[PDB]
């Protein structure tokens, strides 16, 4: 057997007291008032989780894949990486990541304390010295918020090592998995595009097949189904790369000693089992997911003889569009593709369905959809169930939380009719009320963490979506009746009173001036009966280049 987890017996313990509900008393009332559907996981459901991703990984590789593997590899060999420098990966490091313990913390190893560089220094040295002894990481159940479903998610558990190795996987690692996954898999890197650019690739693809049909394949547990052997073939794609020598050392000790796999400890220092598996904590968790994702995926392809396939991968997201056979024999084929999967160590959680619609194609949560710009011209957007973002923003507004899950929603879904009307009436209005427009703010967008004032979302959001995202409409039947039903079961006001709302933070942010006047021109034209003509407006090199969930950075 290969077990992707086994287990002692010790809890998976929370290190403070945890929050499940919204508090009692208004808030995020104005939001939305069925305040009872919406939860936080917490470590009380810790053992549901664990049953889930615990069990025996069977694989078995054929031709298909190791065709496939070869060919990653000889794209990888194109790559030269460079190592970073300890200042530069302490740079990488979020304001708020977890402490180490050694005894210094985030903001120990971004100042460069002696502490924090002794320490980083003693454990690059650790790498290259031993080959062999597996590193301690830490679990903990994740605190994420939903609404209920007619019953409950359980939470997710994240497997981290302590800061100071965080450090040393930037250094080794953090070139590669910023560069390779686009040298191997080129247009099907997901991560390499904006929202716009996803969707022009969404559709642009669509439109060039005689007769489309697209699935998404979602993986059960993906992180629990990733073997030591995909691990080790991860590895194998990594020394392909030009590497310095200090670095090709620190992979390989990272990959035997952290990894394939380790001990797991709790909050209370006990020994809580031992992970064969992925773990969600550690650098190259996005780029060796997208990686594994994309052979196992492109060899069952091939095995299921699928026809003229283009497939875009986001971490364990897959979405393939291929040139349809008919229905019975896209189905057929679609099983044969499962049946690979499987066999490489990939079950489904729910089974696969040919899709002919591409509007009805979720992948990465969202969808392709269609309005029109003030001209008339048809715009393709991406937009998404509002639920969850919805929920998020309501515990947001009434507890205090380091991550801002309503400002990265603005900046990925800036065009939908929901995250017009909801989060930035919403959001604006609090801010503009609390004096803080101009406080800048964390959010994530693909695993990591960016600093972001609010005041700039009119120049983000036109870079990213277009002058479009101001002046969309005639939304589709489809996505209108989604988001009504939607704010139905959430509890959220109606049209008119968002309307309202941002008329007056509209106002109110126009006699500001400068940018606070730009954020009402812009955001809020919705609203007023009389539309203004919008235009132009007078660094982004790193955004939408790669994914890092889990991967400890920031920017
Ligand atoms: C300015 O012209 P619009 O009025 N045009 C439209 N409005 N809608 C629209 C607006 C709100 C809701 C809705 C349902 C619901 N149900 C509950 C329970 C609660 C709440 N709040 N809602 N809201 C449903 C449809 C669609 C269109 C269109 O052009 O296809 C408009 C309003 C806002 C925004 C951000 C953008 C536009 C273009």
């Known amino acids: 057997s290969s077990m992707s987890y086994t287990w002692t017996g010790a809890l998976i313990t929370p290190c403070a007291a945890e929050e499940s509900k919204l508090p009692i008393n208004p808030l995020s009332n104005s939001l939305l008032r069925h305040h009872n559907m919406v939860y936080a996981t917490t470590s009380r459901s810790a053992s549901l989780r664990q049953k889930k991703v615990t069990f025996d990984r069977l694989q078995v590789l054929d031709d298909h894949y190791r065709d496939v593997l070869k060919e990653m590899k000889a794209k990888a060999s194109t790559v030269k990486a460079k190592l970073l420098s300890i200042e530069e990966a ?14 210094y913390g985030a903001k120990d190893v971004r100042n460069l304390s002696s ?21 301690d990481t830490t679990i903990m159940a994740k605190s994420e918020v939903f ?29 590669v998995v910023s560069t390779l996954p686009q040298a191997v898999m080129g247009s099907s890197y997901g991560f390499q595009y904006s929202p716009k650019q996803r969707v022009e690739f969404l559709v642009n693809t669509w439109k060039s097949k005689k007769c489309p049909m697209g699935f998404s394949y979602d993986t059960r547990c993906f992180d629990s189904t990733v073997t030591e052997s995909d691990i080790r073939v991860e590895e194998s794609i990594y020394q392909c790369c030009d590497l310095a020598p200090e670095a090709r050392q620190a992979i390989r000790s990272l990959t035997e000693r952290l990894y394939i796999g380790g001990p797991l400890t709790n909050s209370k220092g ?31 392809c091939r095995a299921a003889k699928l026809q003229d396939c283009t497939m875009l991968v986001n971490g364990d997201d897959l979405v393939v569009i ?20 499987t066999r490489y160590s990939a079950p489904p959680g729910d089974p696969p369905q040919p899709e002919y619609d591409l509007e009805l194609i979720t992948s990465c949560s969202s969808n392709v959809s269609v309005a029109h710009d003030a ?41 939908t009719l929901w995250a017009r009307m909801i989060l930035m009436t919403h959001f ?11 406080k800048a703010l964390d959010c994530q967008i693909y695993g990591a963490c960016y600093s972001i004032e609010p005041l700039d979302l009119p120049q983000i959001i036109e870079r990213l979506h277009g002058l479009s995202a101001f002046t969309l409409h005639s939304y589709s039947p489809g996505e209108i009746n989604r988001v009504a039903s939607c704010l139905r079961k959430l509890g959220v006001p109606p049209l008119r009173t968002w309307r309202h709302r941002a008329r007056s933070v509209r106002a109110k942010l126009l006699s500001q001036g400068g940018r606070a006047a730009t954020c009402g021109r812009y955001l809020f034209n919705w609203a007023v009966r009389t539309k203004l003509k919008l235009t132009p407006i007078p660094d982004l090199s790193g955004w939408f280049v790669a994914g890092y969930s889990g991967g400890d950075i920031y920017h």
């Open 115 to 135: 502490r924090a560089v002794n320490h980083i220094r003693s454990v690059w040295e650790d790498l290259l010295e031993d080959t062999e002894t597996p590193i």
């Open 428 to 438: 604006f209005s609090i801010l503009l009320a609390q004096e803080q427009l101009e």
């Open 375 to 415: 001209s008339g011209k048809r715009v393709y957007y991406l937009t998404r169930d509002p639920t969850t973002p919805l929920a998020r923003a309501a515990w947001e507004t009434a507890r205090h939380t380091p991550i801002n899950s309503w400002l990265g929603n603005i900046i990925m879904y800036a065009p």
């Open 147 to 175: 609404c209920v479903q007619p019953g409950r998610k359980p939470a997710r558990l994240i497997v981290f090592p302590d800061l100071g190795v965080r450090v040393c996987e930037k250094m080794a690692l953090y070139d």
């Open 322 to 341: 291929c040139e349809s056979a008919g229905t019975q024999e896209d189905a057929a084929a679609l099983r044969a593709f499962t049946e690979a999967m």
């Open 270 to 300: 006990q020994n809580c089992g031992y992970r064969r598996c992925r773990a969600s904590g550690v650098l190259t968790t996005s780029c060796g997911n997208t990686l594994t994702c994309y052979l196992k995926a492109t060899a069952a």
């Open 90 to 103: 302490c740079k990488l490091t979020p304001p708020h990541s977890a402490k180490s313990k050694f005894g």
